Design a protein around this nucleic acid. Sequence first.
RNA 1: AGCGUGUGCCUACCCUACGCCGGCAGGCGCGGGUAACCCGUUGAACCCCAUUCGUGAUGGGGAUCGGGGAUUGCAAUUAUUCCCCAUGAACGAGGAAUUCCCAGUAAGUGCGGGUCAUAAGCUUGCGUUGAUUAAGUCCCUGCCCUUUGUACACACCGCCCG
RNA 2: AGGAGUGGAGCCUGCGGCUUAAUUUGACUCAACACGGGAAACCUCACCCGGCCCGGACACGGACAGGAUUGACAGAUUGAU
Lengths: 120, 113, 54, 95, 72
Amino acid sequence: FTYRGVDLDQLLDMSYEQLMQLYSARQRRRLNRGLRRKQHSLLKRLRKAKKEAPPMEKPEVVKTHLRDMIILPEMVGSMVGVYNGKTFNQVEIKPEMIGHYLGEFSITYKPVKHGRPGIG
Amino acid sequence: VQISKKRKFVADGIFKAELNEFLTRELAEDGYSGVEVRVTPTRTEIIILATRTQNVLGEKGRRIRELTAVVQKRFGFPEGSVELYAEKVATRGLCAIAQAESLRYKLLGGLAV
Amino acid sequence: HQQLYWSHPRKFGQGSRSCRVCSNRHGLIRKYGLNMCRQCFRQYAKDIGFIKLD
Amino acid sequence: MPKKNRIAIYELLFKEGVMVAKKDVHMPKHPELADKNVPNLHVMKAMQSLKSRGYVKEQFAWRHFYWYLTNEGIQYLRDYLHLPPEIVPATLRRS
Amino acid sequence: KKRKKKSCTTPKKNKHKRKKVKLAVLKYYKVDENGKISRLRRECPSDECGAGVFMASHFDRHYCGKCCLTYC
RNA sequence: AGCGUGUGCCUACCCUACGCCGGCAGGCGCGGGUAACCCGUUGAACCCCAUUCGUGAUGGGGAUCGGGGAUUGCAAUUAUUCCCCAUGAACGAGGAAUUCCCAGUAAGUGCGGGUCAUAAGCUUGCGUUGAUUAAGUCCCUGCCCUUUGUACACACCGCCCG
RNA sequence: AGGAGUGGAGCCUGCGGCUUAAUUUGACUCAACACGGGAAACCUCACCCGGCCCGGACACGGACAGGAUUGACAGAUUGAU
Ligand SMILES: [Zn+2]
Ligand SMILES: [Zn+2]
């Protein structure tokens, strides 16, 4: 598996200002303006869930509101739960979604199946 | 820093609108009519009109200093630059701004409409 | 609750401006530095000096 | 509110007898009382306490609060901060 | 009349209580009859709360109350 | 061309000439302007003059989509807008029905203002090009006046008979 | 008598119905439907899911300086220093 012609293992130690040249323009600009104070503390939570996880076991589900969190390549495999306005929905991070937002995996609405029309 | 000529004449208006509405809310039951703001290079003069001025100033000018200390502190422009007078309306039975507050005071005191 | 409640950035947008006499946020006249509601401008228009000519 | 706020709000009330505000809870500090860091919420709720007793007299406006001082409110500041009557506020200065 | 009591008030969202032992300066001080001042807890080296305002001594750290300084 | 707007009490928030770097959206400096002083001679668009295309779902039409790039923001994923490639649908002048309008008018064509951190398929004004037909009637839809019928008058959406 | 059309098409925006945790809401012939200056990412925001705060004046009784609330590092708990 790769992404723009480089495998995940070099992405795990790809530096902060060099991984930015692989992303698209929203995500590159977002990493240019910085990750804020409540976004460093999420990655620390995922480190704290990773190195205490058992070596054959994926870590426990962790609850977030941060739907704007970019899926970095150092965030693969974690069980995050991003809110949908009502519930925390369980998300498992795969390596093929490493340029998306976290908030496009809890759908925010019930996909509509129609009924019989009333008085129009 | 100065300001635009378009802003200076509109900000001049909103001064005398808030000043007049404040003095309406204050002296509506003291027969207040209006204000007249004359600006000198020394000071800015505000002339209050009223029916009975001698029952507006308080005693020997006690209520006039509270009013000219409030209107200095609200609109910010400094001390020794604002000063309030109190002149009398000439024909009380002509101006309608004195006849709606007299009629409200007549009605509130329990008189048939 | 100190880095909280009045925390959210109100540096622009619809709900960082309010009328200067209504304290209402809708229908606002920012032109020439009025910053009044469209309803409270119409009450105080002749006091400001905006006369209706045509 | 602490002592250096509730005292310092009452200090400039006796000086000229009037106090203005903004009806702005969220203001960081009152602009007349700089170098003290008293918020507008503190002076607003202090005068809300003083109005129900009858020491001040309230009047509102477009957006701002206004407060004058009654005759029985001068003595409530005269003993709270211990002043002699040999000095006068701005009542009997001009004319 | 013209209401129902409804018995539906649920304020059971318990707050704290300030547990103070009787004159906690005795937890702070210990003096022998010769007159020694044995401050059993650390003193904070801050500028605001130096030499008079005493810290906390937890199970693994020191801890202030004014500036909340921490040690190991 | 014409009407306009432009550095803001809280209040962050602009009109921008000019040089350089960029296909471009933009990025750097560097000046002016609280304005008949600067943008600005407001070097607008249809219009006008030349080349290409040739009656076909075509180079008309641009929807819907896949990749990038850049600004605004604390935040752009349920696309904020903007730029570049690519995809290229319906639509062949519109049934019953219905709207507006008499002269610098209709219609075309852009431009300012409000909204505005970002931003006009809206509205409100302004110009520019600029006509056909009418100078009449009560047929329709309604308004009104006078005579006049009414067993109607919370008033024809009435009152009322099997 | 005409001109431009609209009604057909694509799309943009209102309004009903359906859907929904919520799809906040007023307005229904002219005299509601690009109207509320209503072009909502957050704020606006009313609506939904979850959580903090008092910004409960003043009067009275209790607690009451062997104290009343307050504020606070770490750990757990948490969307969240
Ligand atoms: Zn208003
Ligand atoms: Zn201290």
